[PDB]
């Protein structure tokens, strides 16, 4: 619509990754910065172990009201905008993030 990050970019990978866990009622609608890094591992295989793209960007997203910071452990959560966009970013992944079993 208006704001559309790049492919597998920082702001994109984060809102989308928060999305799946957000769709998890029995798994908390959020994730810690430490858990996110683990999530990205599935976000894309090509990703390398010694490769950590700029993630602090999420902080700036809190300002755009796409993400939500918490108590610190700063739990991050998808807001209305982050949710909408995330659903879109999910289309690209076939939306098989939360539930995966290919192999």
PDB file of N, CA and C in Angstrom:
ATOM      1  N   UNK A   1       0.828  -1.238   0.000  1.00  0.00           N
ATOM      2  CA  UNK A   1       0.000   0.000   0.000  1.00  0.00           C
ATOM      3  C   UNK A   1       0.843   1.260   0.000  1.00  0.00           C
ATOM      4  N   UNK A   2       1.523   1.515   1.113  1.00  0.00           N
ATOM      5  CA  UNK A   2       2.369   2.695   1.240  1.00  0.00           C
ATOM      6  C   UNK A   2       3.799   2.303   1.598  1.00  0.00           C
ATOM      7  N   UNK A   3       3.966   1.697   2.770  1.00  0.00           N
ATOM      8  CA  UNK A   3       5.282   1.270   3.231  1.00  0.00           C
ATOM      9  C   UNK A   3       5.531  -0.194   2.878  1.00  0.00           C
ATOM     10  N   UNK A   4       6.571  -0.439   2.087  1.00  0.00           N
ATOM     11  CA  UNK A   4       6.911  -1.797   1.676  1.00  0.00           C
ATOM     12  C   UNK A   4       8.427  -2.001   1.664  1.00  0.00           C
ATOM     13  N   UNK A   5       8.982  -2.631   2.719  1.00  0.00           N
ATOM     14  CA  UNK A   5      10.426  -2.886   2.816  1.00  0.00           C
ATOM     15  C   UNK A   5      10.940  -3.743   1.664  1.00  0.00           C
ATOM     16  N   UNK A   6      12.256  -3.934   1.616  1.00  0.00           N
ATOM     17  CA  UNK A   6      12.870  -4.735   0.565  1.00  0.00           C
ATOM     18  C   UNK A   6      12.635  -6.223   0.801  1.00  0.00           C
ATOM     19  N   UNK A   7      13.238  -7.055  -0.044  1.00  0.00           N
ATOM     20  CA  UNK A   7      13.092  -8.503   0.069  1.00  0.00           C
ATOM     21  C   UNK A   7      13.971  -9.057   1.188  1.00  0.00           C
ATOM     22  N   UNK A   8      13.347  -9.771   2.126  1.00  0.00           N
ATOM     23  CA  UNK A   8      14.067 -10.355   3.256  1.00  0.00           C
ATOM     24  C   UNK A   8      14.872  -9.293   4.000  1.00  0.00           C
ATOM     25  N   UNK A   9      14.453  -8.037   3.867  1.00  0.00           N
ATOM     26  CA  UNK A   9      15.135  -6.929   4.527  1.00  0.00           C
ATOM     27  C   UNK A   9      15.030  -7.051   6.044  1.00  0.00           C
ATOM     28  N   UNK A  10      15.556  -6.057   6.752  1.00  0.00           N
ATOM     29  CA  UNK A  10      15.515  -6.081   8.201  1.00  0.00           C
ATOM     30  C   UNK A  10      14.116  -5.889   8.756  1.00  0.00           C
ATOM     31  N   UNK A  11      13.507  -4.749   8.444  1.00  0.00           N
ATOM     32  CA  UNK A  11      12.165  -4.441   8.928  1.00  0.00           C
ATOM     33  C   UNK A  11      11.143  -5.477   8.458  1.00  0.00           C
ATOM     34  N   UNK A  12      11.387  -6.063   7.290  1.00  0.00           N
ATOM     35  CA  UNK A  12      10.483  -7.070   6.744  1.00  0.00           C
ATOM     36  C   UNK A  12      10.584  -8.374   7.516  1.00  0.00           C
ATOM     37  N   UNK A  13      11.797  -8.896   7.586  1.00  0.00           N
ATOM     38  CA  UNK A  13      12.050 -10.152   8.263  1.00  0.00           C
ATOM     39  C   UNK A  13      11.552 -10.144   9.708  1.00  0.00           C
ATOM     40  N   UNK A  14      11.606  -8.986  10.359  1.00  0.00           N
ATOM     41  CA  UNK A  14      11.181  -8.886  11.747  1.00  0.00           C
ATOM     42  C   UNK A  14       9.655  -8.920  11.910  1.00  0.00           C
ATOM     43  N   UNK A  15       8.935  -8.058  11.200  1.00  0.00           N
ATOM     44  CA  UNK A  15       7.477  -8.033  11.337  1.00  0.00           C
ATOM     45  C   UNK A  15       6.851  -9.370  10.943  1.00  0.00           C
ATOM     46  N   UNK A  16       7.439 -10.028   9.954  1.00  0.00           N
ATOM     47  CA  UNK A  16       6.923 -11.294   9.480  1.00  0.00           C
ATOM     48  C   UNK A  16       7.183 -12.404  10.489  1.00  0.00           C
ATOM     49  N   UNK A  17       8.368 -12.374  11.070  1.00  0.00           N
ATOM     50  CA  UNK A  17       8.754 -13.373  12.046  1.00  0.00           C
ATOM     51  C   UNK A  17       7.955 -13.210  13.338  1.00  0.00           C
ATOM     52  N   UNK A  18       7.636 -11.965  13.688  1.00  0.00           N
ATOM     53  CA  UNK A  18       6.823 -11.697  14.864  1.00  0.00           C
ATOM     54  C   UNK A  18       5.400 -12.142  14.584  1.00  0.00           C
ATOM     55  N   UNK A  19       5.053 -12.099  13.303  1.00  0.00           N
ATOM     56  CA  UNK A  19       3.717 -12.476  12.852  1.00  0.00           C
ATOM     57  C   UNK A  19       3.347 -13.891  13.266  1.00  0.00           C
ATOM     58  N   UNK A  20       4.135 -14.870  12.843  1.00  0.00           N
ATOM     59  CA  UNK A  20       3.828 -16.261  13.162  1.00  0.00           C
ATOM     60  C   UNK A  20       3.628 -16.480  14.657  1.00  0.00           C
ATOM     61  N   UNK A  21       4.593 -16.073  15.472  1.00  0.00           N
ATOM     62  CA  UNK A  21       4.456 -16.253  16.915  1.00  0.00           C
ATOM     63  C   UNK A  21       3.240 -15.493  17.429  1.00  0.00           C
ATOM     64  N   UNK A  22       2.908 -14.405  16.747  1.00  0.00           N
ATOM     65  CA  UNK A  22       1.749 -13.619  17.145  1.00  0.00           C
ATOM     66  C   UNK A  22       0.482 -14.435  16.931  1.00  0.00           C
ATOM     67  N   UNK A  23       0.484 -15.230  15.866  1.00  0.00           N
ATOM     68  CA  UNK A  23      -0.657 -16.082  15.565  1.00  0.00           C
ATOM     69  C   UNK A  23      -0.666 -17.300  16.478  1.00  0.00           C
ATOM     70  N   UNK A  24       0.213 -17.281  17.474  1.00  0.00           N
ATOM     71  CA  UNK A  24       0.306 -18.383  18.430  1.00  0.00           C
ATOM     72  C   UNK A  24      -0.321 -18.018  19.776  1.00  0.00           C
ATOM     73  N   UNK A  25      -1.583 -18.423  20.007  1.00  0.00           N
ATOM     74  CA  UNK A  25      -2.280 -18.154  21.268  1.00  0.00           C
ATOM     75  C   UNK A  25      -1.630 -18.876  22.440  1.00  0.00           C
ATOM     76  N   UNK A  26      -1.146 -20.084  22.175  1.00  0.00           N
ATOM     77  CA  UNK A  26      -0.506 -20.886  23.207  1.00  0.00           C
ATOM     78  C   UNK A  26       1.012 -20.734  23.145  1.00  0.00           C
ATOM     79  N   UNK A  27       1.466 -19.696  22.449  1.00  0.00           N
ATOM     80  CA  UNK A  27       2.894 -19.471  22.332  1.00  0.00           C
ATOM     81  C   UNK A  27       3.258 -18.007  22.489  1.00  0.00           C
ATOM     82  N   UNK A  28       2.358 -17.248  23.111  1.00  0.00           N
ATOM     83  CA  UNK A  28       2.568 -15.819  23.333  1.00  0.00           C
ATOM     84  C   UNK A  28       2.594 -15.059  22.009  1.00  0.00           C
ATOM     85  N   UNK A  29       1.927 -13.911  21.979  1.00  0.00           N
ATOM     86  CA  UNK A  29       1.873 -13.088  20.776  1.00  0.00           C
ATOM     87  C   UNK A  29       3.083 -12.161  20.696  1.00  0.00           C
ATOM     88  N   UNK A  30       4.271 -12.724  20.902  1.00  0.00           N
ATOM     89  CA  UNK A  30       5.503 -11.935  20.866  1.00  0.00           C
ATOM     90  C   UNK A  30       6.742 -12.817  20.985  1.00  0.00           C
ATOM     91  N   UNK A  31       7.909 -12.182  20.895  1.00  0.00           N
ATOM     92  CA  UNK A  31       9.176 -12.888  21.009  1.00  0.00           C
ATOM     93  C   UNK A  31      10.269 -11.951  21.511  1.00  0.00           C
ATOM     94  N   UNK A  32      11.268 -12.515  22.181  1.00  0.00           N
ATOM     95  CA  UNK A  32      12.380 -11.727  22.694  1.00  0.00           C
ATOM     96  C   UNK A  32      13.449 -11.572  21.620  1.00  0.00           C
ATOM     97  N   UNK A  33      14.257 -10.521  21.726  1.00  0.00           N
ATOM     98  CA  UNK A  33      15.301 -10.270  20.735  1.00  0.00           C
ATOM     99  C   UNK A  33      16.182 -11.503  20.544  1.00  0.00           C
ATOM    100  N   UNK A  34      16.370 -12.262  21.616  1.00  0.00           N
ATOM    101  CA  UNK A  34      17.191 -13.465  21.559  1.00  0.00           C
ATOM    102  C   UNK A  34      16.488 -14.577  20.787  1.00  0.00           C
ATOM    103  N   UNK A  35      15.174 -14.685  20.968  1.00  0.00           N
ATOM    104  CA  UNK A  35      14.405 -15.718  20.283  1.00  0.00           C
ATOM    105  C   UNK A  35      14.260 -15.398  18.800  1.00  0.00           C
ATOM    106  N   UNK A  36      14.156 -14.111  18.489  1.00  0.00           N
ATOM    107  CA  UNK A  36      13.999 -13.686  17.103  1.00  0.00           C
ATOM    108  C   UNK A  36      15.159 -14.174  16.245  1.00  0.00           C
ATOM    109  N   UNK A  37      16.372 -13.952  16.734  1.00  0.00           N
ATOM    110  CA  UNK A  37      17.578 -14.369  16.028  1.00  0.00           C
ATOM    111  C   UNK A  37      17.499 -15.845  15.643  1.00  0.00           C
ATOM    112  N   UNK A  38      16.862 -16.638  16.495  1.00  0.00           N
ATOM    113  CA  UNK A  38      16.710 -18.065  16.226  1.00  0.00           C
ATOM    114  C   UNK A  38      15.663 -18.279  15.143  1.00  0.00           C
ATOM    115  N   UNK A  39      14.604 -17.489  15.225  1.00  0.00           N
ATOM    116  CA  UNK A  39      13.508 -17.557  14.269  1.00  0.00           C
ATOM    117  C   UNK A  39      13.988 -17.298  12.845  1.00  0.00           C
ATOM    118  N   UNK A  40      14.837 -16.288  12.691  1.00  0.00           N
ATOM    119  CA  UNK A  40      15.363 -15.920  11.377  1.00  0.00           C
ATOM    120  C   UNK A  40      16.015 -17.118  10.689  1.00  0.00           C
ATOM    121  N   UNK A  41      16.591 -18.010  11.485  1.00  0.00           N
ATOM    122  CA  UNK A  41      17.238 -19.194  10.931  1.00  0.00           C
ATOM    123  C   UNK A  41      16.315 -19.917   9.950  1.00  0.00           C
ATOM    124  N   UNK A  42      15.016 -19.901  10.244  1.00  0.00           N
ATOM    125  CA  UNK A  42      14.044 -20.558   9.373  1.00  0.00           C
ATOM    126  C   UNK A  42      13.507 -19.571   8.349  1.00  0.00           C
ATOM    127  N   UNK A  43      13.567 -18.299   8.710  1.00  0.00           N
ATOM    128  CA  UNK A  43      13.118 -17.215   7.847  1.00  0.00           C
ATOM    129  C   UNK A  43      13.721 -17.355   6.452  1.00  0.00           C
ATOM    130  N   UNK A  44      14.867 -18.028   6.386  1.00  0.00           N
ATOM    131  CA  UNK A  44      15.564 -18.256   5.125  1.00  0.00           C
ATOM    132  C   UNK A  44      16.776 -19.158   5.352  1.00  0.00           C
ATOM    133  N   UNK A  45      16.958 -20.198   4.517  1.00  0.00           N
ATOM    134  CA  UNK A  45      18.089 -21.123   4.648  1.00  0.00           C
ATOM    135  C   UNK A  45      19.416 -20.472   4.271  1.00  0.00           C
ATOM    136  N   UNK A  46      19.435 -19.836   3.101  1.00  0.00           N
ATOM    137  CA  UNK A  46      20.646 -19.170   2.619  1.00  0.00           C
ATOM    138  C   UNK A  46      21.368 -18.390   3.720  1.00  0.00           C
ATOM    139  N   UNK A  47      20.635 -17.967   4.749  1.00  0.00           N
ATOM    140  CA  UNK A  47      21.244 -17.217   5.845  1.00  0.00           C
ATOM    141  C   UNK A  47      22.441 -17.972   6.418  1.00  0.00           C
ATOM    142  N   UNK A  48      23.516 -17.245   6.703  1.00  0.00           N
ATOM    143  CA  UNK A  48      24.719 -17.860   7.253  1.00  0.00           C
ATOM    144  C   UNK A  48      24.810 -17.642   8.762  1.00  0.00           C
ATOM    145  N   UNK A  49      25.449 -18.579   9.488  1.00  0.00           N
ATOM    146  CA  UNK A  49      25.602 -18.481  10.945  1.00  0.00           C
ATOM    147  C   UNK A  49      26.297 -17.192  11.368  1.00  0.00           C
ATOM    148  N   UNK A  50      27.379 -16.853  10.672  1.00  0.00           N
ATOM    149  CA  UNK A  50      28.116 -15.645  10.991  1.00  0.00           C
ATOM    150  C   UNK A  50      27.548 -14.419  10.305  1.00  0.00           C
ATOM    151  N   UNK A  51      26.295 -14.515   9.869  1.00  0.00           N
ATOM    152  CA  UNK A  51      25.633 -13.405   9.192  1.00  0.00           C
ATOM    153  C   UNK A  51      24.442 -12.904  10.001  1.00  0.00           C
ATOM    154  N   UNK A  52      24.561 -11.687  10.522  1.00  0.00           N
ATOM    155  CA  UNK A  52      23.495 -11.087  11.315  1.00  0.00           C
ATOM    156  C   UNK A  52      23.129  -9.703  10.783  1.00  0.00           C
ATOM    157  N   UNK A  53      22.152  -9.629   9.859  1.00  0.00           N
ATOM    158  CA  UNK A  53      21.713  -8.356   9.275  1.00  0.00           C
ATOM    159  C   UNK A  53      21.268  -7.355  10.339  1.00  0.00           C
ATOM    160  N   UNK A  54      21.270  -6.051  10.007  1.00  0.00           N
ATOM    161  CA  UNK A  54      20.862  -4.999  10.945  1.00  0.00           C
ATOM    162  C   UNK A  54      19.455  -5.226  11.487  1.00  0.00           C
ATOM    163  N   UNK A  55      19.371  -5.640  12.747  1.00  0.00           N
ATOM    164  CA  UNK A  55      18.080  -5.893  13.378  1.00  0.00           C
ATOM    165  C   UNK A  55      17.622  -4.742  14.279  1.00  0.00           C
ATOM    166  N   UNK A  56      18.549  -3.977  14.903  1.00  0.00           N
ATOM    167  CA  UNK A  56      18.171  -2.848  15.762  1.00  0.00           C
ATOM    168  C   UNK A  56      17.130  -1.942  15.104  1.00  0.00           C
ATOM    169  N   UNK A  57      16.959  -2.102  13.793  1.00  0.00           N
ATOM    170  CA  UNK A  57      15.991  -1.312  13.039  1.00  0.00           C
ATOM    171  C   UNK A  57      14.597  -1.424  13.649  1.00  0.00           C
ATOM    172  N   UNK A  58      14.307  -2.577  14.249  1.00  0.00           N
ATOM    173  CA  UNK A  58      13.006  -2.804  14.868  1.00  0.00           C
ATOM    174  C   UNK A  58      12.674  -1.691  15.856  1.00  0.00           C
ATOM    175  N   UNK A  59      13.703  -1.150  16.503  1.00  0.00           N
ATOM    176  CA  UNK A  59      13.495  -0.062  17.447  1.00  0.00           C
ATOM    177  C   UNK A  59      12.819   1.103  16.740  1.00  0.00           C
ATOM    178  N   UNK A  60      13.315   1.415  15.547  1.00  0.00           N
ATOM    179  CA  UNK A  60      12.743   2.492  14.755  1.00  0.00           C
ATOM    180  C   UNK A  60      11.312   2.151  14.361  1.00  0.00           C
ATOM    181  N   UNK A  61      11.038   0.856  14.202  1.00  0.00           N
ATOM    182  CA  UNK A  61       9.700   0.411  13.834  1.00  0.00           C
ATOM    183  C   UNK A  61       8.711   0.667  14.965  1.00  0.00           C
ATOM    184  N   UNK A  62       9.177   0.541  16.208  1.00  0.00           N
ATOM    185  CA  UNK A  62       8.317   0.802  17.355  1.00  0.00           C
ATOM    186  C   UNK A  62       7.734   2.199  17.223  1.00  0.00           C
ATOM    187  N   UNK A  63       8.542   3.091  16.660  1.00  0.00           N
ATOM    188  CA  UNK A  63       8.143   4.471  16.447  1.00  0.00           C
ATOM    189  C   UNK A  63       7.057   4.553  15.383  1.00  0.00           C
ATOM    190  N   UNK A  64       7.178   3.727  14.344  1.00  0.00           N
ATOM    191  CA  UNK A  64       6.190   3.717  13.278  1.00  0.00           C
ATOM    192  C   UNK A  64       4.922   3.018  13.743  1.00  0.00           C
ATOM    193  N   UNK A  65       4.975   2.482  14.961  1.00  0.00           N
ATOM    194  CA  UNK A  65       3.840   1.795  15.557  1.00  0.00           C
ATOM    195  C   UNK A  65       3.528   0.483  14.843  1.00  0.00           C
ATOM    196  N   UNK A  66       4.547  -0.136  14.250  1.00  0.00           N
ATOM    197  CA  UNK A  66       4.352  -1.414  13.569  1.00  0.00           C
ATOM    198  C   UNK A  66       4.677  -2.548  14.527  1.00  0.00           C
ATOM    199  N   UNK A  67       5.606  -2.275  15.435  1.00  0.00           N
ATOM    200  CA  UNK A  67       5.999  -3.239  16.450  1.00  0.00           C
ATOM    201  C   UNK A  67       5.682  -2.677  17.830  1.00  0.00           C
ATOM    202  N   UNK A  68       5.812  -3.501  18.858  1.00  0.00           N
ATOM    203  CA  UNK A  68       5.513  -3.061  20.213  1.00  0.00           C
ATOM    204  C   UNK A  68       6.575  -3.548  21.191  1.00  0.00           C
ATOM    205  N   UNK A  69       7.252  -2.605  21.852  1.00  0.00           N
ATOM    206  CA  UNK A  69       8.292  -2.939  22.826  1.00  0.00           C
ATOM    207  C   UNK A  69       7.683  -3.191  24.198  1.00  0.00           C
ATOM    208  N   UNK A  70       8.355  -4.010  25.000  1.00  0.00           N
ATOM    209  CA  UNK A  70       7.827  -4.339  26.316  1.00  0.00           C
ATOM    210  C   UNK A  70       8.863  -4.174  27.441  1.00  0.00           C
ATOM    211  N   UNK A  71       8.428  -4.569  28.633  1.00  0.00           N
ATOM    212  CA  UNK A  71       9.173  -4.503  29.894  1.00  0.00           C
ATOM    213  C   UNK A  71      10.704  -4.560  29.797  1.00  0.00           C
ATOM    214  N   UNK A  72      11.258  -5.188  28.764  1.00  0.00           N
ATOM    215  CA  UNK A  72      12.720  -5.306  28.650  1.00  0.00           C
ATOM    216  C   UNK A  72      13.236  -6.330  29.669  1.00  0.00           C
ATOM    217  N   UNK A  73      13.363  -7.643  29.311  1.00  0.00           N
ATOM    218  CA  UNK A  73      13.068  -8.224  27.984  1.00  0.00           C
ATOM    219  C   UNK A  73      11.973  -7.506  27.207  1.00  0.00           C
ATOM    220  N   UNK A  74      12.405  -6.752  26.204  1.00  0.00           N
ATOM    221  CA  UNK A  74      11.498  -5.972  25.384  1.00  0.00           C
ATOM    222  C   UNK A  74      10.738  -6.851  24.413  1.00  0.00           C
ATOM    223  N   UNK A  75       9.640  -7.423  24.883  1.00  0.00           N
ATOM    224  CA  UNK A  75       8.824  -8.273  24.033  1.00  0.00           C
ATOM    225  C   UNK A  75       8.308  -7.461  22.850  1.00  0.00           C
ATOM    226  N   UNK A  76       8.480  -7.984  21.644  1.00  0.00           N
ATOM    227  CA  UNK A  76       8.002  -7.258  20.478  1.00  0.00           C
ATOM    228  C   UNK A  76       6.710  -7.866  19.959  1.00  0.00           C
ATOM    229  N   UNK A  77       5.790  -7.005  19.536  1.00  0.00           N
ATOM    230  CA  UNK A  77       4.508  -7.494  19.046  1.00  0.00           C
ATOM    231  C   UNK A  77       4.064  -6.723  17.808  1.00  0.00           C
ATOM    232  N   UNK A  78       3.305  -7.393  16.951  1.00  0.00           N
ATOM    233  CA  UNK A  78       2.806  -6.781  15.725  1.00  0.00           C
ATOM    234  C   UNK A  78       1.570  -5.928  15.989  1.00  0.00           C
ATOM    235  N   UNK A  79       1.614  -4.678  15.544  1.00  0.00           N
ATOM    236  CA  UNK A  79       0.478  -3.785  15.702  1.00  0.00           C
ATOM    237  C   UNK A  79      -0.387  -3.857  14.437  1.00  0.00           C
ATOM    238  N   UNK A  80      -1.507  -3.108  14.350  1.00  0.00           N
ATOM    239  CA  UNK A  80      -2.377  -3.144  13.166  1.00  0.00           C
ATOM    240  C   UNK A  80      -1.611  -3.100  11.845  1.00  0.00           C
ATOM    241  N   UNK A  81      -0.716  -2.133  11.701  1.00  0.00           N
ATOM    242  CA  UNK A  81       0.063  -2.000  10.476  1.00  0.00           C
ATOM    243  C   UNK A  81       1.018  -3.176  10.294  1.00  0.00           C
ATOM    244  N   UNK A  82       1.785  -3.488  11.336  1.00  0.00           N
ATOM    245  CA  UNK A  82       2.717  -4.600  11.241  1.00  0.00           C
ATOM    246  C   UNK A  82       2.012  -5.898  10.921  1.00  0.00           C
ATOM    247  N   UNK A  83       0.773  -6.014  11.383  1.00  0.00           N
ATOM    248  CA  UNK A  83      -0.023  -7.206  11.145  1.00  0.00           C
ATOM    249  C   UNK A  83      -0.396  -7.296   9.674  1.00  0.00           C
ATOM    250  N   UNK A  84      -0.950  -6.205   9.158  1.00  0.00           N
ATOM    251  CA  UNK A  84      -1.357  -6.156   7.756  1.00  0.00           C
ATOM    252  C   UNK A  84      -0.182  -6.475   6.850  1.00  0.00           C
ATOM    253  N   UNK A  85       0.886  -5.704   6.998  1.00  0.00           N
ATOM    254  CA  UNK A  85       2.070  -5.911   6.190  1.00  0.00           C
ATOM    255  C   UNK A  85       2.578  -7.339   6.345  1.00  0.00           C
ATOM    256  N   UNK A  86       2.674  -7.798   7.589  1.00  0.00           N
ATOM    257  CA  UNK A  86       3.160  -9.148   7.862  1.00  0.00           C
ATOM    258  C   UNK A  86       2.388 -10.189   7.063  1.00  0.00           C
ATOM    259  N   UNK A  87       1.066 -10.046   7.012  1.00  0.00           N
ATOM    260  CA  UNK A  87       0.245 -10.982   6.257  1.00  0.00           C
ATOM    261  C   UNK A  87       0.717 -11.014   4.811  1.00  0.00           C
ATOM    262  N   UNK A  88       1.136  -9.848   4.334  1.00  0.00           N
ATOM    263  CA  UNK A  88       1.630  -9.720   2.971  1.00  0.00           C
ATOM    264  C   UNK A  88       2.992 -10.391   2.825  1.00  0.00           C
ATOM    265  N   UNK A  89       3.915 -10.031   3.711  1.00  0.00           N
ATOM    266  CA  UNK A  89       5.248 -10.608   3.695  1.00  0.00           C
ATOM    267  C   UNK A  89       5.162 -12.124   3.802  1.00  0.00           C
ATOM    268  N   UNK A  90       4.071 -12.579   4.402  1.00  0.00           N
ATOM    269  CA  UNK A  90       3.843 -14.007   4.597  1.00  0.00           C
ATOM    270  C   UNK A  90       3.484 -14.702   3.287  1.00  0.00           C
ATOM    271  N   UNK A  91       2.788 -13.983   2.415  1.00  0.00           N
ATOM    272  CA  UNK A  91       2.385 -14.537   1.127  1.00  0.00           C
ATOM    273  C   UNK A  91       3.602 -15.053   0.374  1.00  0.00           C
ATOM    274  N   UNK A  92       4.669 -14.269   0.424  1.00  0.00           N
ATOM    275  CA  UNK A  92       5.911 -14.622  -0.246  1.00  0.00           C
ATOM    276  C   UNK A  92       6.470 -15.948   0.270  1.00  0.00           C
ATOM    277  N   UNK A  93       6.298 -16.205   1.565  1.00  0.00           N
ATOM    278  CA  UNK A  93       6.793 -17.439   2.160  1.00  0.00           C
ATOM    279  C   UNK A  93       5.738 -18.531   2.077  1.00  0.00           C
ATOM    280  N   UNK A  94       4.620 -18.216   1.432  1.00  0.00           N
ATOM    281  CA  UNK A  94       3.548 -19.184   1.342  1.00  0.00           C
ATOM    282  C   UNK A  94       2.803 -19.267   2.656  1.00  0.00           C
ATOM    283  N   UNK A  95       3.255 -18.455   3.611  1.00  0.00           N
ATOM    284  CA  UNK A  95       2.657 -18.400   4.937  1.00  0.00           C
ATOM    285  C   UNK A  95       2.860 -19.717   5.678  1.00  0.00           C
ATOM    286  N   UNK A  96       3.928 -20.423   5.322  1.00  0.00           N
ATOM    287  CA  UNK A  96       4.252 -21.697   5.950  1.00  0.00           C
ATOM    288  C   UNK A  96       5.331 -21.513   7.012  1.00  0.00           C
ATOM    289  N   UNK A  97       5.370 -20.324   7.609  1.00  0.00           N
ATOM    290  CA  UNK A  97       6.366 -20.027   8.633  1.00  0.00           C
ATOM    291  C   UNK A  97       6.029 -20.733   9.943  1.00  0.00           C
ATOM    292  N   UNK A  98       4.961 -20.278  10.596  1.00  0.00           N
ATOM    293  CA  UNK A  98       4.531 -20.872  11.859  1.00  0.00           C
ATOM    294  C   UNK A  98       4.535 -22.396  11.766  1.00  0.00           C
ATOM    295  N   UNK A  99       3.824 -22.926  10.775  1.00  0.00           N
ATOM    296  CA  UNK A  99       3.750 -24.368  10.574  1.00  0.00           C
ATOM    297  C   UNK A  99       4.612 -24.795   9.390  1.00  0.00           C
ATOM    298  N   UNK A 100       5.668 -25.551   9.675  1.00  0.00           N
ATOM    299  CA  UNK A 100       6.572 -26.024   8.633  1.00  0.00           C
ATOM    300  C   UNK A 100       6.911 -27.499   8.826  1.00  0.00           C
ATOM    301  N   UNK A 101       7.042 -28.219   7.717  1.00  0.00           N
ATOM    302  CA  UNK A 101       7.365 -29.634   7.784  1.00  0.00           C
ATOM    303  C   UNK A 101       7.776 -30.199   6.439  1.00  0.00           C
ATOM    304  N   UNK A 102       8.423 -29.371   5.625  1.00  0.00           N
ATOM    305  CA  UNK A 102       8.872 -29.793   4.304  1.00  0.00           C
ATOM    306  C   UNK A 102      10.278 -30.382   4.369  1.00  0.00           C
ATOM    307  N   UNK A 103      10.472 -31.510   3.692  1.00  0.00           N
ATOM    308  CA  UNK A 103      11.773 -32.154   3.686  1.00  0.00           C
ATOM    309  C   UNK A 103      11.682 -33.645   3.423  1.00  0.00           C
TER     310      UNK A 103
END
